[PDB]
Design a protein around this ligand. Structure first.
Ligand SMILES: Nc1nc(N)nc(-c2cc(F)ccc2O)n1
Length: 294
């Protein structure tokens, strides 16, 4: 891009390719996302444009929205490392519990803020969570999903990750609620703790069944209305719920209790980000400095 200089290709998300770039004129280093195409809804640019007004310490700042030559560019403040990379780098020893707790607390503050502003993420995953050297963690790509839709993959033949998708989405619900983000974050919390994805599905049905094998096949008792969901099939196998202490060992009972509330089947029973911030698990929360190798 004439105004910048692709330092490097950062990565690839469900909505587009991300680049690290320096504003040739201002020298500011930013993350530039290119949205993939002759229509380009004008209702979306307005939607996205409103996101520039979102300012919170745990939300990656959206600096600009540029529509040109069919291409759409989102300019974000740049952070050096995503959580997926950090988890991989910390796989041998594991992320210390105090840091896991700090990150979870911060992410809930970010979700509490967005949700109070009626903004949902809808596609949270480790790759969408960014960290810096001072111990902060921030959510990136909030609200893009709503202003947009949902491509078959990403944009150019790439396996979209289903591991963090809430059951109501997998069952075909047409209306999403803030609960979908709490579910994704619970899946991420578990993954930081055990160092293994909680529900690593390789297909939509495998994703759903992995959830059922662990949390039990949902029924009308625990989830009123589940048997009427669009993709619910009476033929789903009926698996018994697993003892919860086997899911995220060796997490303590405060942590297991909070996780269980973030993973309730019924979106209406699932804990809100604000209520989660008050959970006893955070009574001793601190803000540790991570060991980041950049
Ligand atoms: N994979 C990756 N890696 C890194 N380092 N950064 C980012 C990044 C993504 C955004 F959407 C906004 C800002 C960012 O910095 N993404």
């Amino acid at each position: 891009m004439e105004n910048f200089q692709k330092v490097e290709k950062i990565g690839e998300g469900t909505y587009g390719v991300v680049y690290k770039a320096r504003n040739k004129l201002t020298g500011e280093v930013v993350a530039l996302k290119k949205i993939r195409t002759e229509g380009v809804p004008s209702t979306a640019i307005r939607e996205i444009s409103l996101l520039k007004e979102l300012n919170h310490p745990n939300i990656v700042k959206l600096l600009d929205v540029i529509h040109t030559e069919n291409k759409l560019y989102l300019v974000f403040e740049f952070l050096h490392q995503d959580l997926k990379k950090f988890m991989d780098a910390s796989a041998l020893t594991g992320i210390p519990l105090p840091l896991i707790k700090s990150y979870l607390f911060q992410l809930l503050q970010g979700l509490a803020f967005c949700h109070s502003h009626r903004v949902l993420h809808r596609d949270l995953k480790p790759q969408n969570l960014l960290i810096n050297t001072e111990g902060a963690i921030k959510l990136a790509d909030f609200g893009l999903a709503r202003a947009f839709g949902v491509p078959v993959r990403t944009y150019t033949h790439e396996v979209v990750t289903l591991w963090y998708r809430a059951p109501e989405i997998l069952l075909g619900c047409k209306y999403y609620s803030t609960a979908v983000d709490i579910w994704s974050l619970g899946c991420i919390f578990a993954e930081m703790v055990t160092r293994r994805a909680l529900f690593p599905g390789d297909s939509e049905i495998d994703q759903l069944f992995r959830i059922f094998r662990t949390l039990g096949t949902p029924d009308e008792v625990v989830w009123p209305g589940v048997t009427s969901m669009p993709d619910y099939k009476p033929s789903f196998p009926k698996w018994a719920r697993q003892d919860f202490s086997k899911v995220v060992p060796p997490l303590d009972e405060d942590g297991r209790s909070l996780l269980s509330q973030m993973l309730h089947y019924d979106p209406n029973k699932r804990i809100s980000a604000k209520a989660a911030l008050a959970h006893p698990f955070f009574q001793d929360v601190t803000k540790p400095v991570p060991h980041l190798r950049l």
